[PDB]
Amino acid sequence: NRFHCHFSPRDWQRLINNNWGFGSAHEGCLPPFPADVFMHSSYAHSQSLDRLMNPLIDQLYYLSKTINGSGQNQQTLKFSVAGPSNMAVQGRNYIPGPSYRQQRVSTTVTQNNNSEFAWPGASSWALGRNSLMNPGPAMASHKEGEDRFFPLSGSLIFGKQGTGRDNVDADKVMITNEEEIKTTNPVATESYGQVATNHQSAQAQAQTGWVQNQGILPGMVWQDRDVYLQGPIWLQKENSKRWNPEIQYTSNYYKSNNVEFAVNTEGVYSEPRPIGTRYLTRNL
Amino acid sequence: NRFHCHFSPRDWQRLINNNWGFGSAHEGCLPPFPADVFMHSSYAHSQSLDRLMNPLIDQLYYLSKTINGSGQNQQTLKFSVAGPSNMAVQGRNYIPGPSYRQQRVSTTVTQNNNSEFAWPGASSWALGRNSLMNPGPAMASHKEGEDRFFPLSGSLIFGKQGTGRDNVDADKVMITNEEEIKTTNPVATESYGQVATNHQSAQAQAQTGWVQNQGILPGMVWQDRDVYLQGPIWLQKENSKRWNPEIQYTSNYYKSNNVEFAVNTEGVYSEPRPIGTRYLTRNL
């Protein structure tokens, strides 16, 4: 019940580059390399959920100004059209999926708080027993343009070949991230949004509060979590008209001591990095 | 009669990544990009011609020693088995393709000779007129590990969008290199080999000389020149058993001002770089 049982790295590549689509995760599964003896959406959206609009055309009205100016008794109601100049306010038919917030850790240790927060700060659910939320609801790992942060228990973590059982270093393990699904899913380490916490009046300002967890609301859409060559298990052709070339999964051509996904001098087969399948793209 | 007339960059990608195979090169061809109004083996060998041997097993004898040691009257004949320890001397059934040597030029200008050698130092043929040899026979552009050098007239040089007509800088053009064909083809800037220039005797040393050009000899095998998205014109599925993943042509993941192979703000379509056809690999 893992993909690398049935797929070679080249067969896996043949699958993920050309195609839009096709039980406790325990050990003892059939080896990924046939000589050893032992004892779904696959694309990344090319558009975000908030950008689906036509950029050239105005729309509907929103509330632009609650005060004419500074002073006393300046209350007013002014309205504007939603359009390309301000895209944040426009009306939209669909909204991003549910979220249950994960604590954010940094691969740079000095960015992290100096305290043991591994079990203390993690998200969890009760059943009178506490169970860590892992990996949890599907959420993007980090915001676009961020490479050092990762959710505390948000994503799957595989060990490299030869990694020990207990208290291994960061380098030894491989942590998967799901940036690709960020277009329609909330970031795992961020609030889902803000709500209004009161009724305003002349004497009390409008108050807001953060939403740390948000369940299913009508109109939400989301992407599920990706499958990996190493991950658990339980063709659709690429029809796209895209003009410019796709991102494909490839192997770097640069002299190295070993070949990736091949045996080394001592006969040990290894899988260098986690390969998930989201490379081609679709319009949202 | 150019490939980008008939193929989009995306369609070109599908062709070169998935397949092993499928008039003076003047201007005036239909524009690469459809909105403008105007006035073969696609693979790289995974083995090299000199290495086709079984690395674990011996072969046939060669002449190892012509003298016992330092001294006088030391003439003797020794022989050894051709085997893995010395692979240079083994008997081989097939030898690399023909060559006509090109002058070598570096893209680092300070290590180029300080003289005008464009026309004087160029390989050429005569038919009472002297025609430059361009691009010439199919030959590798450079030795593995030297990317800076290119044959003076050896490769096809395409201009970038907007490049002027006369005396443009080296960054206004695109220089293609046939790196992939080196396995079966001699380097364009290197001699084909050495031959004996005399009969050795007790009174004369064995004298050799460089072969600067070579025509077809029985038992040569060679690759033809690659074709490009831009280049002139006038399917086979991949059967490979390779375990590890192939090299593919991929777009870059980094953020940039403009998307590759698209229009900019002024509406000018451009092709950022040349695309060869050779990515998948075969055995030799």
């Epitope: 691969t107 343009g145 961020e146 050092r148 942060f149 770097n252 390969i275 | 993941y253 980094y254």
Partner: antibody, heavy 129, light 106 residues
Framework: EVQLLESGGGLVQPGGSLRLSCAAS????????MSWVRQAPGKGLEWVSL????????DYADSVKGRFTISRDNSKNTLYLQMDSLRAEDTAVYYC??????????????????????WGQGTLVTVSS | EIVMTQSPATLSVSPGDTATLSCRAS??????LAWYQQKPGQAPRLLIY???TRATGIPARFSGSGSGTEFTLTISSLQSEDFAVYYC????????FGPGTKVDIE
């Protein structure tokens, strides 16, 4: 092969700011993390600042912090360094350097940089009046 | 701010002789280190990384050793091609270099 080449460095008066650039080629620039390192004329080597991959993570040495800003343009395979508010204490040869470890979208930038894999021929910066 | 210490401040040996270079670390750096030679008027070049591994294209006469605080660089069969200052780096916490050791020829 890998080739790191540093552009203009000159003479700047104290408090002046100049910009350095490094043209990298022969390797996929976006994938690796680039670093500036400094050698004062008689002194040994000192690391200055690092930028990784996309440029999301940037760190500086405590000596240069707040004066210096590093940036890269993956589009043009160039690394930049903007020196601001220089002192006479900030004059040495500057080296463009490369991280060995390879970065792709399916993974995270390693927390720290490793040994320096390749080096450019450094450009010199004198700060004096 | 682990402080690195290059044990010989300078050194002089004749060609063909082994030369034992060593540096120390203010705190444990476990098999995270490197060795560079800087010839006069050149940029440094990687010799050894981790504790002992030779960089690609480096002669086999260079060898590293040591873990934790103290490390050693040894040059077998020293030649005249080698005249350089040798540095050691740590890639634990924030990178710091040793002061260097100049190997002088007799």
């Amino acid at each position: 092969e890998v080739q790191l080449l540093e552009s203009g460095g000159g003479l700047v008066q104290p408090g002046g700011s100049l910009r350095l650039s490094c043209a990298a080629s022969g390797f996929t620039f976006s994938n690796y993390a680039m670093s500036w390192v400094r050698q004062a004329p008689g002194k040994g080597l000192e690391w200055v600042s690092l930028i990784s991959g996309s440029g999301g993570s940037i760190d500086y040495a405590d000596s240069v912090k707040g004066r210096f800003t590093i940036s890269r343009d993956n589009s043009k395979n160039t690394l930049y360094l903007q020196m601001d508010s220089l002192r006479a204490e900030d004059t040495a040869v500057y080296y463009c350097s490369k991280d060995p470890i390879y970065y792709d979208l399916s993974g995270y930038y390693a927390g720290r940089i490793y040994y320096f894999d390749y080096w450019g021929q450094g450009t010199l910066v004198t700060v004096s009046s | 701010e682990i402080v690195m210490t290059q044990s010989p401040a300078t050194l002089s040996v004749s060609p063909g002789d082994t030369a034992t270079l060593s540096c120390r670390a203010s705190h444990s750096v476990s098999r995270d280190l490197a060795w560079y030679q800087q010839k006069p008027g050149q940029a440094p070049r990687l010799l050894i990384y981790d504790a002992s591994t030779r960089a690609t294209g480096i002669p086999a006469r260079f060898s590293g050793s040591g873990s934790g605080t103290e490390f050693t660089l040894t040059i077998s069969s020293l030649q005249s091609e080698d005249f350089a200052v040798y540095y050691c780096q740590q890639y634990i916490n924030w990178v710091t270099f040793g002061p260097g050791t100049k190997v002088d020829i007799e």
